[PDB]
Amino acid sequence: WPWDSVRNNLRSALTEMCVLYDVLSIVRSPQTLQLISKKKSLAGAAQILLKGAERLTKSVAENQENKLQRDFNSELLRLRQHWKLRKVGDKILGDLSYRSAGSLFPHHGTFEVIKNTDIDLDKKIPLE
Amino acid sequence: REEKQLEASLDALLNQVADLKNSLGSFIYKLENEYDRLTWPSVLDSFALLSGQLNTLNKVLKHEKTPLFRNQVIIPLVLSPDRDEDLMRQTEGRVPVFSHEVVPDHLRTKPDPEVEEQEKQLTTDAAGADAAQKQIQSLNKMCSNLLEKISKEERNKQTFNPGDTNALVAAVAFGKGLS
Amino acid sequence: NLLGISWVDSSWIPILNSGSVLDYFSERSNPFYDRTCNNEVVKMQRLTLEHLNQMVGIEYILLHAQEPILFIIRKQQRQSPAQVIPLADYYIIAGVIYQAPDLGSVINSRVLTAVHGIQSAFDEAMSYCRYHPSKGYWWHKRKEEPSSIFQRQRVDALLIDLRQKFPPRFVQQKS
Amino acid sequence: QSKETLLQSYNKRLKDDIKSIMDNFTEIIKTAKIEDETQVSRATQGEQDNYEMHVRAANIVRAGESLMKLVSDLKQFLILNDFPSVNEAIDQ
Amino acid sequence: PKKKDVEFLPPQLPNDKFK
């Protein structure tokens, strides 16, 4: 909705400029509107907070109820604690090159998580 | 006196609003060529920066040190649909050259408002204003007390003792303290 | 509430002369102005102008001289001179009948229009696409991967040895 | 090198922004608009004081109810400690 | 009319292998 929002902003700016120019040229019952407005504002704030809570605590509660397929906080620490330590060239942490006692030749590790639409899929980090 | 200061403040606010509108238009035009990787947070921040600065200036120049609105009357300079070459650079946004058959659907400052009548008709359908006001006042008082409490509540173990280190270094070599 | 009317001047104002406005406003047929004006109070006895703007009468008087379009019709009612109590505007100025307010009402209308546009933009951008806790958690090929070698990269140096032995021929004919 | 300082500063800034957003919903602590004191206009200025929540109230709540989980994930990923410094049972 | 210049930069094979 790039063009739609652009046109809306343009119309709003045109209206604002017209009102400002007009002001410059001119310069030289049981209604309870406040109560209804406050009620509508409270309803809107409650709807926004409910949408936020649904986005946060309902779509991220997968591993909270039962450990399922999720690379987030369930896969990376596994392989970390099991094989190597953390390091940051860019995202390269503990490549397996026997550098502890090799002393022959160095080799780095291009290890990085990736996404794919499937069931039970890990990060699958990349001689070969 | 006060009228001149109000006019100068209104002119400065209009200039700032025009600059902010030009900046927002340039940003929106930059959001059309680079349509990819358009995060919602950047658009939200742009919309907040484009609305807040203008709305605050508009509200400050309307409910702060204003005289009674019964003496001042609204009167424009002139209503002439003449095409002048020395007057098209003095409106800054619209009314460059007025048309002939434009009086009907252009004269109400291009009225966008369409929900005001619907809201009025919906409120008229509910025709008791004493408990609601009291509850609103109580909620306002509670929010004020909470904000005051928050404002009132809002307002490195060492392990490298140099003395002990120097003493140990001395005892390592000098006999004073060591033996 | 004399602002709900959305009338305009198309044929009732055939001329903008001095005497034409008074004749148009005094004879509303059908719609020319408010029929509850002091026309009857001025024509009650005879053709005069005391009850129009001179004497103490609640009439739509010319608050200011404006020959070009129309004088500022205001409900003038004051025992002393040089005084005008404004409450509305039924004139044909600006092609609309506003409340004759100061910059306040104009700024309020501008802010309302801007808020409407902002709400429309927010609603349009909200339900388009949104990020989630997981990157593309929905649905529950090689154009960026550049395989670098840099061992035999020397080939590029050999690359600048063919155009020198024989260069390509420009065509400028995209048949 | 001290890169954790920038991370701590970013986390503190995120927390301060979240606190300010949670505190930014008390601008009506001084009054509840029991009367219509709008001298300029009461139809489009005074009545629309709360009808423009999209640019006044809903304009800060959107970003204010988004930085929490984002900052949490940023802190948990940028700093995914894994630094027991002894690997206690790992050697085991 | 495809090109009226001499180009060798577009390849620009990156390294991204900082150790």
Side-chain angles (χ1 to χ4, degrees), chain A residues 2 13 30 43-46 52-53 61 71-72 76-79 82-83 86-90 94-95 98 101-102 105-107 109 111 126, chain B residues 8 12 18 25 41 48 52 67 76 81 93 96 104 111 113 126-129 131-132 162-163 167 170-171 173 175 177, chain C residues 4 14 19 31 57 65 68 81-82 86 88 94-95 100-101 104 114 117 121-122 125 133 136 146-159 161-169 174-175, chain D residues 1 32 43 46 57-58 63-64 76-78 83-84 89, chain E:
Chain A
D71 173 58
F72 302 89
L76 69 161
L77 308 96
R78 222 171 178 176
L79 198 39
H82 200 279
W83 197 264
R86 279 209 295 124
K87 191 254 287 181
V88 177
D90 178 22
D95 165 77
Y98 283 11
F105 34 78
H107 293 270
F111 310 138
Chain C
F122 271 116
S147 198
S148 159
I149 40 167
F150 287 165
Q151 318 111 334
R152 285 143 205 181
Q153 55 83 32
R154 325 276 304 276
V155 59
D156 57 28
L158 271 75
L159 192 140
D161 293 82
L162 280 296
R163 192 176 306 189
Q164 295 82 347
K165 289 175 75 69
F166 34 86
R169 292 182 183 174
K174 203 202 302 180
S175 64
Chain D
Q1 199 268 350
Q76 200 35 66
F77 194 90
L78 172 147
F83 282 161
Chain E
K2 48 180 289 294
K3 273 180 156 182
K4 333 281 170 303
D5 51 353
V6 194
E7 54 278 354
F8 309 109
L9 282 193
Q12 185 36 54
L13 293 189
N15 220 317
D16 59 64
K17 210 57 67 183
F18 308 145
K19 301 92 171 163

